[PDB]
Amino acid sequence: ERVILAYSGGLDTSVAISWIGKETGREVVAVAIDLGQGGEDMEVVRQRALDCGAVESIVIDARDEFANDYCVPAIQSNALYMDRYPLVSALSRPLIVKHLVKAAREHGGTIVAHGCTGKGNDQVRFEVGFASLAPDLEVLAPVRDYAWTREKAIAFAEENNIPINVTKRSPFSIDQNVWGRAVETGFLEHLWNAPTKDVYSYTEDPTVNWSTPDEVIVGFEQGVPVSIDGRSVTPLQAIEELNRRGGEQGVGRLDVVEDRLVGIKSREIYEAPGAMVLITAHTELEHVTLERELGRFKRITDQKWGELVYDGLWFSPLKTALESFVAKTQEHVTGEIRMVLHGGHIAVNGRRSPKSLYDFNLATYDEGDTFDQSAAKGFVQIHGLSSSISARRDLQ
Amino acid sequence: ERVILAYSGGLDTSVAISWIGKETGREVVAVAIDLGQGGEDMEVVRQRALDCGAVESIVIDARDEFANDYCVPAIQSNALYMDRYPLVSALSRPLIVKHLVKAAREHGGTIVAHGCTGKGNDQVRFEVGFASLAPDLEVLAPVRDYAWTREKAIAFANVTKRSPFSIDQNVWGRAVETGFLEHLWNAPTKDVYSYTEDPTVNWSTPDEVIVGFEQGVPVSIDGRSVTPLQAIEELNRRGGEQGVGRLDVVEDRLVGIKSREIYEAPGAMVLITAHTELEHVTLERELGRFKRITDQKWGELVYDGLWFSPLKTALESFVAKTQEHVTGEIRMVLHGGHIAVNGRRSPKSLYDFNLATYDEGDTFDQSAAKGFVQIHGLSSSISARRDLQ
Amino acid sequence: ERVILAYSGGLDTSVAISWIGKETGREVVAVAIDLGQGGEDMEVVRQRALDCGAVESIVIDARDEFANDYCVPAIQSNALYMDRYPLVSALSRPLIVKHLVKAAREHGGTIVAHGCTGKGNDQVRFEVGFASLAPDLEVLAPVRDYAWTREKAIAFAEENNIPINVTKRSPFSIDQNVWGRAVETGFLEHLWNAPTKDVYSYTEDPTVNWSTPDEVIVGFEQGVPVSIDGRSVTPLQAIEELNRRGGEQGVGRLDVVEDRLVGIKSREIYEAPGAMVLITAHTELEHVTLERELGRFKRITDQKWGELVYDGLWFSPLKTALESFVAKTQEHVTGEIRMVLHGGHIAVNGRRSPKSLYDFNLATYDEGDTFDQSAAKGFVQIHGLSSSISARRDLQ
Amino acid sequence: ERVILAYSGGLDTSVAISWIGKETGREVVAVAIDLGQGGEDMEVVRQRALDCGAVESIVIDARDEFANDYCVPAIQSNALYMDRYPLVSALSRPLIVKHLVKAAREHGGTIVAHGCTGKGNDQVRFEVGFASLAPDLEVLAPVRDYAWTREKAIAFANVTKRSPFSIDQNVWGRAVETGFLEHLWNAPTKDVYSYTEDPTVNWSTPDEVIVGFEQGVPVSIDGRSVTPLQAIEELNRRGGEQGVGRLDVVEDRLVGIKSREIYEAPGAMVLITAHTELEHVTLERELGRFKRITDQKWGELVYDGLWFSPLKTALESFVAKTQEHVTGEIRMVLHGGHIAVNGRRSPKSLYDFNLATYDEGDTFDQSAAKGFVQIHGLSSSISARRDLQ
Ligand SMILES: [Cl-]
Ligand SMILES: [Cl-]
Ligand SMILES: [Cl-]
Ligand SMILES: [Cl-]
C-alpha cells in the first residue's frame, strides 16, 4: 500500500517523503507534473524525490492537457473571480488531482497526501476532488492536521541526514505555471502597502516600450484560440506567446482583495498576461457573435462557473452541466480580435468574423440602410407599457 | 396648449421650432439644460430659441443634480453595460425627461417633442420616461415619425458645415459616432478623442491618486473633500491626461441590433473602479456575489430605458442598504490608459490581518477546516459516486 | 405563389380563405394539424377548407411529435409560468410554425397568414417563429392589421355564398389540445367573478370520488415519462392517461392572473391535469436524483426557460443553449414517483430510483448510521465566518 | 459565569441542567419560550428547570413577536424551500438565538448551550446566529460534541416512554420524523398528522375564505381584522379542517445529505399562496420575474442558517420596497387538501379591465403590436439567419 503525493522539489515535501514513510510505514510515490512552472529541470526534481527516499518518482508532462482541458474552459467562461483575476492557482488543482488518482491506481496507492494549510483554498480544491474521484483513498494533510512545519522538517532532515537544501527561504512565496503566477509576501498583507518591482517576474514594468506598442490579432474557432497574427497555434502556444507579448507590455498585473471560501478576505498579487489577453479577446468576440439575451444570461453563468471552480467544485454536477451550456454557446464563437498591448493595458480596436451578428446595413444611416424604423414607435409603446401602468398606480 | 422640447442650439432643432409652429399651430417652449456638455454659452443658446420663434426659452443648470442623483447611483451599482462602458448617454435621459415634464406643467405644455431616431436607444429612454411620468402629454417625434432632417430643415428655412462626427457629451462622458468606424476592422484615429489625451503624452509622469467614499458616495480626492460633481470633473482631468477611459465597444441595442461605439469616460471609470475595489474590502462574500447580479441587472434596466421602472426603484432600496458601510479610500495609479490599484484603507474594513496572516498574531483556527471541507464537498461527492457507479 | 395558413375549421378563418384569395389574388393552402384537440373529425375539417375555396387542404397528425419534442421539454424544465400554469397555448405554437413553413416549401408558399390579435401572446409566438425560420416569407395578420372581424367575415360569406356555419358563438372561447385547455369568457374578465361549472371540460368537479382516490406511479427514464403503474407508455400515452386519471379527480384546474408580454395583466382559466401530474412528478424525481446546488441553479433555468417560451422565444439561442444544459441534467433523472390524485390535489407519497442520491445510512440515526458528525462543528464555524465578521463590523 | 440554554421540559435537557452543573461547575439559566407549541403549561415547565437545579428559570411569550417579525417576512418572500414547504423549523431559530443572547446579558451568561445534532440544520441556525450576535459567548453542544443522549441522561439521574415520533411544532407549522418514513417507498399513515384532518372528513363542506393584506402583511379574514398571529391561527384551523398544508418532501440539507420530511403547515400555505396571488395582481411583470429569484434566495439563506447575514438583511430592504402596494383581498376555496383561488380585488390593482377586454370599452391600441413584435424578435432572428446560413 503506497502513499501518493504531488511533488515539486521543495524542502517541506522532500522531507515529508521519508517522514510519511516513518509515520505510516508505507512506501511513497512522488508525482511531479510539468505545467510550465519553469525553474528546475523536471529530471532534477524527479531524482531529488528518489534521493529523499521515494520508492518511485515520476514526471508527467501535462502542459498541453492543462491548456486544452482546463485553461480553454476558463477562457470560454471568461473566468474572472471577483471580476478581477482568471483563477490563477485554481485551474490546475483538478488536473493535479486527476493525475494523483491515476498514479494511485497504477502504483498501488491507498493514500494520497497534500501539503495545503487550513486557511487556504487549495485544501478544498484537492480534498473535494479526491472525495469525488476516489473516495476509497485516505487523504493525509500533514501541514494542516499533523503540524508539519518547515522547522519540524529541518529538524527531521538533520536527524535523518536527508540530502536537502535548507538555506533561508526568500521573503516571497511563489506559485506559478504557464497560466499565471501568484506571489505572497508578508509586506503585502497590509492593504496600504504597495507592491515593489521585486514582486514581479512574468511581466515587465508597464512604463517600458513607450514608443513600441504591440498590436496583436487573436483568432478563435468555436471558442478555442487557434491563431495569432494569422499564424496557427495550439492553445498552449497561444498562452505562451501572449504571456510573452503581453508581459513585455506590463499587461496582466493584478492586485486583488479577494473572498476566500473559508470565510476570510486576503490580499493577493497575480501576473497573468496571456490569460487576460485571451479572456479579453474571447469576450470581445462573444459581443460580435452571441445574441443579446444569450449574452446577458451568459454573464450570469460565466460568474457562476468562476465561483464553482474557485470553491473547489470543478467536478461538481452544476459545473459539468454548465459546460454543456457553454459548449452550445461556443458553436459560432469564431473570428479574430485585434488589440493593442501597451502600458499595462489591453485596448481592443478591431473585430472580424465569418459568424458575425453585426449587420452593417441595419446599423448604418448610409445609403445601404435596411432598418425599418416604422416598427419603433409601437415597440417603445409596448416595451414601456407594464412599467407605465405601474407608475400610474404609484402616482394615483 | 404648447409644445415643450429640449434645445441645444443646433440647426435642425432651431428650425424645428418654426416648423412645429406652422404644422401644429402651437407655441413652443425651448428647454436648455446644462449637464457639463460645454459648447456655446447657455444664454446665447437661450436667445437663439427666442429668435427662432419660441414663446419661452429657459436654461436649467442641472450639473449637480446630474452628478448627485444619476451618476452617483451608477457608481453605486458599478454600472458597466456589456461589462464595458458606464452607460454614457443613458444616464442623463431620465433627468432630461423630468425637467421637460416640469416645464410642461409650468408653461401650459400638452405636447413634448424629441429628436431621437427610430434605430437608437434614446427614443426608448425618452418615451418610456414620458409614458411613466406624464402619460397625459402627447409625444412628438419629428425625426423618427415626420422625416425631419437637416435637409428638410435647411429647405424649410445660419448653416454650419456637417461634421463627420456625431458627438454626444456631458460631464459624465463622451460618445462618438462616425461612418468610418461602422466598419469593425477600422481602428479609431486620434481625431475621435477630446476628453482624453493619448496614453503616450504624459507617460513619464504616472499619477497616483487616492479616492475616498462615504456610504458609497465619492467624497474626497487625495484627502481633499469634493462634491460628487467635483469628483467627476477632477478625475476626468487626471484620468484624461493619462488616456484613461478610452472605450471601443460592440454593444447590443435594445432595438435588436449590434453597433460599434466609441466612448471617453475617464472620471467615470476611475470612480467605478475605485468603488468596486472598496466593496471588495467592505462587503461580505455572498452579498458581493449576489450584488454582481444586481449590478448587472441595474445596468440593463437603465440601458433599456427603464430608469423609472418598479424593478429599478426596488433595486435602489437593495443598493442603499449595501452602501451603508462602503466607506474608505482606494489608491490607484493612472498611466498608459490603465487604472492600477495599489492601496486600500477603511474604517469599515472586513479584512482581518490576524485571520489572514501566518505571523505570530495569527488568529485563524485551522482545526475547523477539515470538517468544513468534508461537508462542503459531500453533496457533490455523493453525486460523483452515483455517476461512477 | 401560395398563401399558407393554419386551419382548424372555424368561421373566421374559413371565410378568410376566399377573402385572402380575393385580396391577394393568390391561391390558399390550408394546413390542419391534429394536436389532440378533439372535436370535429380532421377529414371534415380538411374538406371544409376545400369547400371554402382552398386550392390544397392538408391534415398533419402531429400528436406524437407534439408530446415528444414540445411537451417533454416543458416537463424537463418543470415549466410553470407565474409559478402557476404549464404554458398551455404556448407550447404548440413553434410546432405549428414549423409545419407552416414546411408546407410553404412544399406547396410554393410565399406568404403565411395567421389570425392572432394585437393584444395577445400568440401573435408574438407565430411571428417571431416565422422571422427566425423563414424570414423570406411575408406574414399576413388579417385580424390585427386588416380589421378582419366576425362581422366582416359573415358579410363576406353572405355576399359570396360561402358554405359556412354562422350560428351564434357560445359565450366561451376555447383553445385546447392534448396538453391542456384554455377558456376565455367575458364574465371572468372581472377578477371578483368566480368560474362556474360550465367553464370546465377536461376535468371533473374536485368533489367527485370522495371515497375513491387514485394512487398512481409515474416512471421516468432520463427525464422522459416512460411508465405508469409499471406499464410502459409513450410520452403521448402518458399525457393522455394522466389527463384522464387526473381529470377524474379534478386535478389541474388553474385560475391565474398573468403578465402578458405585450404589457398587460389578464385573467385566465386553464385545465391541465396530465401536465400538472407529470411536472409535479418530474420535480419530485429531481429532488431525489439531482445534487443540491445543481437543483438550486436549475430552479433559475427552469424559470428562464418558461419565460422564453411564453415570450415567443422558443427558437431563440438562449432557449436552445438552455436545452443543452437541461439535457445534461436529465442524464440520471430516472425513477418512479407515487402520488395520490384526489380532491383537485396532487399528493406525493413515494419515491424510488436506481440513480438515487438519497443515502439512508447517512440520514438515519439507526444502527446503520454512517454520517461522521465530527466534521460538523468545523463546518458550521467556517460556513458562518464571513457573515460573522460582517456582523462584528456592523455592531462595532 | 453562567450557562444559558433553551428549555422545553424534556427529559434529556432536564438532566443536562444537572450534568452541565457538575461538568462545568457553573450555574444554569433555563429559558422557555412560548411560540405556540402547545404541550405542558409554561409555569410547570419553568418550575421543573428549578427542581432540576437551574439557578434561574424564565418564560418568554414570543408568539406575537414570532408572527410579526419572522413569519410575516417569510410570507413577504413567499418562502418555500425546494419550492415545497415554508421553512418549518427554520424561522423560529433566529428568534430563539436572540432571546438566549438577551438572557445571557441579563443573567451573567458566558456560555450558551444547545441540543442540536451533528447532521441536522438546526446546529447551523443556532451556531451561526450566536457567532453573529454574540461571538464572545462560548457555545456548548452536549448532544453533538459530548455524546449526550437519553441513555446517558437516564444513567446520570420522571422517565416517559420513547415516542416513535420526533415532533417539532409551533404556531407556524409542525415537522414529523419517524424511522418508518426514512424509507422513501413508505407512505405516511394517519397517526403522523395532528394539525390537519384528512381531506375526506369535511369534504361535504368546502370552506371559501377571503384573506386581506395591507402592504404585504395579512390584516383581515372574511372582512374581520386580525393580527398576524391571529391570521396564522385562524387559517391553521380552517385549512387544517380541510386537510390543507400536508407536505411530504425530500429536501437538501445544508450539511450535504438528502432527507425525507413530513410537515403540516395549513395556515402558512394559505397565507403564502394568497400573498403570491396578490403580488400577481399588484406587481409589474419584470419586477415579479426578478422577485421570484429573490424569493428563492431568501428561502435558501434562511434555510442555510443565514437569517442574520448581510445578504439576507439587504434583500429585506428590497422586499420592503416591493411590498408598498401589495394590498388587497384574495378569495380561495379550501377543500380536498387543496387551495383553489377564485377571486381577487385590490385598490392598488395593476389589472386594467379596459386594456384587457374586447368589449366596447377596449382601450388597447393594437397598432403598436406589429412593430413591437418585429423588434422584440429581431436579435434572435438575426442569430437564426446566421445559424442557418
Ligand atoms: Cl492554475
Ligand atoms: Cl449620460
Ligand atoms: Cl400548447
Ligand atoms: Cl419555525
Q: Is C250 left (phi over 0), alpha (psi -120 to 50) or beta?
A: left
Structure-block grid coordinates of residue D165:
415520533
Q: A 266-295 residues with CB below 8 A of B?
A: 266-267, 283-284, 287-288, 291-292, 295
One-letter amino acid at D117 equals T
Short-list C268, C269, C307, C303, CA closest to C283? C303
Residue B349 to residue B330: CA distance in whole angstroms? 12
Contact call for C264 and A389, based on CB within 8 A: yes
CA distances from B270 to B65, B241, B267, B294, B339 (A): 20, 13, 5, 21, 7
**In this structure, are C107 and C190 located in the same domain?**
no
3 state SS of A335: strand
Write the CA distances from C33 to A150, C64, D201, integer angstroms.
Answer: 77, 12, 46
Order of strands across the sheet with D109-113? D56-61, D27-34, D2-6, D109-113, D138-140
- Does residue D191 share a domain with residue D335? yes
C240: part of which helix (H) or strand (E)? Answer: helix C235-247
Experimental technique: X-ray
Question: Is C292 found in the same domain as C219?
Answer: yes
Task: Flag if B375 and C379 touch (Cβ within 8 Å).
Answer: yes
| Among chain C residues, CA nearest to D381 | C132
* A85 secondary structure, DSSP code: B
Grid cell locating D383: 442569430
C-alpha to C-alpha distance for A270 and B357, rounded to whole angstroms: 18
Closest ligand by atom to D88 CA: 4
| Direct distance between the N- and C-terminal alpha carbons of chain C, in angstroms, rounded to an integer | 79
- For C263, counting Cβ atoms within 10 Å of its Cβ (0-12 exposed, 13-18 middle, 19+ buried), the class is buried
Contact A374 D371 (CB under 8 A): yes
Sheet holding B217-221, edge to edge: B224-225, B217-221, B207-214, B328-335, B338-345
Which domain, by its residues, includes A374?
Answer: 360-396
Helix (H, G, I), strand (E, B) or coil at C161: coil
C-alpha distances in angstroms, D194 versus A17, A282, D161, D167, D190? 62, 60, 20, 10, 9
CB < 8 Å & 24+ apart, contacts of A371-376:
A371/B118, A371/B119, A371/B257, A372/D374, A373/B117, A373/B118, A373/B119, A373/B144, A374/B118, A374/D371, A375/B118, A375/D370, A375/D371, A375/D372, A375/D374, A375/D375, A376/B118, A376/B119, A376/B123, A376/B144, A376/B255, A376/D371, A376/D375
- Which has the closest alpha carbon to A21: A7, A6, A1? A1
Residues B181 and B286 in one domain: yes
C141 touches chain D (CB under 8 A): yes
* Non-local CB neighbours of D305 within 8 Å, separated by 6+ positions: C380, C383, C384, D93, D121, D124, D125, D126, D127, D128, D129, D254
Which residue type, as a one-letter code, is found at position B22?
K
Catalytic (active site) residue A173:
yes
Please give the Cα distance from B104 to B184 (Å, whole number): 42
User: Considering only CA atoms, which of C82, C58, C53, C88 is closest in space to residue C70?
Assistant: C88
Closest-lying ligand to the alpha carbon of D81?
Answer: 4
- The minimum CA-CA distance between A330 and chain B, rounded to whole Å, is 18
Clarify whether D144 is annotated catalytic.
no
Measure the CA–CA gap between A84 and A310, rounded to whole angstroms: 13
Amino acid at A87: L
Q: Identify whether the C-beta of residue B316 lies closer than 8 Å to the C-beta of residue B77.
A: no
Residues 6+ apart with CB under 8 A from C125: C90, C93, C94, C97, C312, C314
Contacts of C45-49 with CB under 8 Å at 24 or more apart are C45/C7, C45/C8, C45/C9, C48/C9, C48/C14, C48/C164, C49/C7, C49/C9, C49/C14, C49/C17
Q: In this complex, which of D257, D318, D375 lies closest to B318 when CB atoms are compared? A: D318
Question: CATH number of the domain that A3 lies in?
Answer: 3.40.50.620
CA B282 → CA A303, B76, D92, D276, distances in Å?
20, 13, 30, 35
Whether B34 and B82 share a structural domain: yes
Same domain, B41 and B174: no
Of C118, C141, C172, the position where a domain reaches its end is C172
CB contact set of A306 (below 8 Å; sequence gap of 6+):
A77, A79, A80, A81, A87
Same domain, C179 and C318: yes
Strand partners, B344: B330
Contact (CB<8Å) C390/B352: no
User: Residue length, chain B?
Assistant: 389
C8 is in an annotated binding site: yes
Determine the distance in angstroms separating the CA of C113 from the nearest CA of chain B, rounded to an integer.
24
| Cell matching residue A331 | 458553436
Pick from C293, C357, C378: which is nearest to B372 by CB?
A: C378
* Sequence letter at residue C361: N
Q: How many residues would you count in chain A?
A: 396
For residues B143 and A2, give the distance between their C-alpha atoms in angstroms, rounded to a whole number.
Answer: 80
Look at A381 and B131 and tell me if their CB atoms are within 8 Å.
yes
**Known binder of ligand: residue B220?**
no
Tracing cell 421539454 back to the chain, one arrives at: C73
As a whole number of angstroms, the distance between CA A242 and CA A248 comes to 9
Beta strands in C19-96 (DSSP E): 27-34, 56-61
- Separation of alpha carbons C316 and C318, rounded Å: 5
Number of structural domains, chain A?
Answer: 3
CA nearest to B269, candidates B19, B46, B92, B79: B79
Q: Are residues D289 and D172 in the same domain?
A: yes
Q: Helix, strand or coil for residue A341?
A: strand
List phi, psi (to 5°) of D200: -75, -15
Among residues B202, B209, B201, B206, which one has the least CA distance to residue B341? B209
Residue C120 contacts A, CB cutoff 8 Å: no
Asked whether A118 and B366 are in contact (CB, 8 A), the reply is yes
> How distant is the alpha carbon of residue A396 from its chain centre?
54
Flag if C380 and D285 touch (Cβ within 8 Å): no
HEC letters along chain D: CEEEEECCCCHHHHHHHHHHHHHHCCEEEEEEEECCCCCCCHHHHHHHHHHCCCCEEEEEECHHHHHHHHHHHHHHCCCCECCCECCCCCCHHHHHHHHHHHHHHHCCEEEEECCCCCCCCHHHHHHHHHHHHCCCCEEECHHHHCCCCHHHHHHHCCCCCCCCEEEEEECCEEEEEEHHHHCCCCCCCHHHCCCCCCCCCCCCCCEEEEEEEECCEEEEECCEECCHHHHHHHHHHHHHHCCCCEEEEEEECCCCCEEEEEEECHHHHHHHHHHHHHHHHHCCHHHHHHHHHHHHHHHHHHHCCCCCCHHHHHHHHHHHHHHHHCCEEEEEEEECCEEEEEEEECCCCCCCHHHHCCCCCCCCCHHHHHHHHHHHCHHHHHHHHHHHC
Whole-angstrom distance, CA of residue A7 vs CA of residue A45: 8
Report the DSSP beta bridge partners of residue A227. Answer: A219, A232
Check if the beta carbon of residue A276 is closer than 8 Å to that of residue A252: yes
- With 0-12 / 13-18 / 19 or more C-beta atoms within 10 angstroms meaning exposed / middle / buried, residue A221 is middle
Catalytic residues of C: 12, 93, 122, 173
Distance between Cα C351 and ligand 3 center (Å): 29
Question: Which one of A332, A359, A378 has the shortest CB-CB distance to D370?
Answer: A378
Distance from the CA of B60 to the center of ligand 4, in angstroms? 56
d(CA B312, CA B297): 8
CB C208 within 8 Å of CB C248 = yes
Q: What would the grid cell of residue C185 be? A: 369568457
Q: Is C34 annotated as a binding residue?
A: no
Contact indicator for A172, A183 with CB cutoff of 8 Å: yes
Cβ neighbours of D360 (radius 10 Å): 6
Among A332, A376, A389, beta carbon nearest to D371: A376
The secondary element (H helix, E strand) that includes residue C390 is helix C385-395
Amino acid occupying residue C91: L
Residue B150 touches partner A, C-beta closer than 8 Å? no
D160 and D187 part of one domain: no
What CATH number is attached to the domain comprising D281? 3.90.1260.10
Length of chain D (residues): 389
* DSSP for residue B163: P
Grid cell digits, residue C68? 415528444
Distance between CA A290 and CA A350 in Å, rounded? Answer: 17
Helical H runs in chain A? Answer: 11-24, 42-51, 63-66, 72-76, 92-106, 122-133, 142-145, 150-160, 235-247, 273-289, 292-310, 317-329, 360-363, 376-383, 385-395
DSSP string, A257-292: EEE-TTS-EEEEEEE-HHHHHHHHHHHHHHHHHS-H
Region of B191 on the Ramachandran plot (φ > 0 left; ψ -120 to 50 alpha; else beta): alpha
Comparing CA positions, the residue from A299, A294, A7, A38 lying closest to residue A179 is A38
Contact C127 D257 (CB under 8 A): no
D30 Cα to chain A: minimum distance (Å): 33
Give me the residues of C, 323-352, that contact B with CB < 8 A: 332
Residue D338 · residue C344 · CB < 8 Å: yes
Considering the domain architecture, whether residues B341 and B363 belong to the same structural domain is answered as no
CATH of the domain at C378: 1.20.5.470
> Of C154, C172, C190, which marks where a domain is finished?
C172
Q: For cell 428549578, name the residue.
A: D50
Question: Which is the catalytic residue, given D46, D93, D238, D246?
Answer: D93
Task: Give residue D283's identity as a one-letter amino acid code.
Answer: L
The phi, psi pair for C358, rounded to 5°, reads: -70, 130
Q: Helices marked H in chain B — which ranges?
A: 11-24, 42-51, 63-66, 72-76, 92-106, 122-133, 142-145, 150-156, 228-241, 266-282, 285-303, 310-322, 353-356, 369-376, 378-388
CA distance C381 to chain B (A): 7
Which of A144, A172, A200 corresponds to the end of one domain?
A: A172
Burial C324-343 (b: 16+ CB within 10 A, else e): bbbbbbbbbbbbbbbbbbbb
- A378's grid cell: 409601437
Distance C176 CA to ligand 3 centre (A): 7
Per DSSP, the three-state class of C67 is helix
- Does A356 appear as a known binding residue? no
Cell of A351: 473585430
Return the residue in A145, A294, A308 with the most chain C beta carbons within 10 A, the one to mutate for interface testing: A294
Tell me: is residue A6 an annotated ligand-binding position: yes
Q: Is B289 found in the same domain as B158?
A: no
* Domain shared by D185 and D115, yes or no: no
What cell numbers appear for A158 in the block? 538533520
Cross-strand bridge partners of residue C176: C181
- The chains in contact with chain B, meaning 3 or more Cβ pairs closer than 8 Å, are A, C, D
Paired with B140 in beta bridges are B113
What is the distance between the alpha carbons of residues C82 and C165, in angstroms, rounded to a whole number?
38
How far, CA to CA in Å, does C177 sit from each of C67, C76, C181? 11, 19, 6
Q: Catalytic one among D26, D34, D69, D122?
A: D122
Query: Can you tell me which residue has the cell 454512517?
Result: C370
Q: Under DSSP, is residue A87 helix (H, G, I), strand (E, B) or coil?
A: coil
